[PDB]
Structure formats: structure tokens, C-alpha cells
Design a protein around this nucleic acid. Structure first.
Length: 135
DNA sequence: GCGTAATCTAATCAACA
DNA sequence: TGTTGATTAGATTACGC
């Protein structure tokens, strides 16, 4: 990988309380739920998404260690993020960047956002998918 | 150093031209 | 329908405290 990752966030206690309470309600929130929590506690939705991935990993691993069944999905699955439209010039920017560095740090990713107008979070997924499809 | 946010791979679901 | 964006499980990495 590269270097220069995002500076880790530190949850305030109230933020932790809010994430844990949301998680009780449903450990598989949709984009509508994630954006709703994001705005309630004043952090960007992408940080919320990463915290649910990590909190599920922790719950699964504890359930596993306690030899307990994971409830899993409950209720109707909530809607996904709408698919991001990526123009041909946006794709071109990204492709050039990818040729020089497959593993951009937060620095590189945030300027691509400036340049392409795409969200940094979507750029990060773009590279994940590109790497996994173009060794 | 600990705890865990941030990052990663791989497999898969699914939108859209 | 094929391309590719979005999500998941789970492993790993590297920071703030």
C-alpha cells in the first residue's frame, strides 16, 4: 500500500453512544440511515459507514468467540447508495492517477476530488475496484 | 503499547448504457 | 448483458492517546 492515510477520528462519548444505539436498531443501515446519523452527530457519512463495517467485524468476532449465532440481516434491507455517475473526463483523470500510483494516500485522493468533483470516499472505492480488476 | 479507525483483498450484489 | 460502482466479511496496518 501507500502512505499518508487519513488522520484517525476520535469519537466523543456522546458520538459513541449514538453509533451504538443506532447499531442496536439495525446493524445493516442504508444510506438514508447512515446520512441521518452522520448529520445527527456531526461527522461525515463515510466515517459512519467505516464504523459499521468495523463494529460488525467486532460483533461477529465476539459472537464467534462466545459461540453464539449472529442474528444477521433483520427486516427489509434498506436502500443502497445511488450509483455514482463517473464521466469520461473523470474516468480519464482517475486512470492517469492510477498509472502513476495504485495506492494514493489521503493527500492524493483529496486533490482528485477537487479536480474530478467526485467525493473522496467514492474515489477510494474506485481505486479498490480498479486494483482488483487490473493487476 | 493499546485499542481501533483506516485500509486492504476478494467475492458478490446490482445500476445503467 | 458487460462494465463497473457499492457492499460485505474479515485480515491487516498505523496512529492518538
Amino acid at each position: 500500500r501507500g502512505r499518508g492515510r487519513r488522520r484517525r477520528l476520535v469519537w466523543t462519548p456522546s458520538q459513541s453512544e449514538a453509533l451504538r444505539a443506532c447499531f442496536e436498531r439495525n446493524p445493516y443501515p442504508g444510506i438514508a440511515t447512515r446520512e441521518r446519523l452522520a448529520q445527527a452527530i456531526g461527522i461525515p457519512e463515510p466515517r459512519v459507514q467505516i464504523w459499521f463495517q468495523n463494529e460488525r467485524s467486532r460483533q461477529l468476532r465476539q459472537h464467534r468467540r462466545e459461540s453464539r449465532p449472529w442474528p444477521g440481516r433483520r427486516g427489509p434491507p434498506e436502500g443502497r447508495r445511488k450509483r455514482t455517475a463517473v464521466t469520461g473526463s473523470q474516468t480519464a483523470l482517475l486512470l492517469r492517477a492510477f498509472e502513476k500510483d495504485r495506492f494514493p494516500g489521503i493527500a492524493a485522493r483529496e486533490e482528485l476530488a477537487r479536480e474530478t468533483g467526485l467525493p473522496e470516499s467514492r474515489i477510494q472505492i474506485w481505486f479498490q475496484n480498479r486494483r482488483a480488476r487490473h493487476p
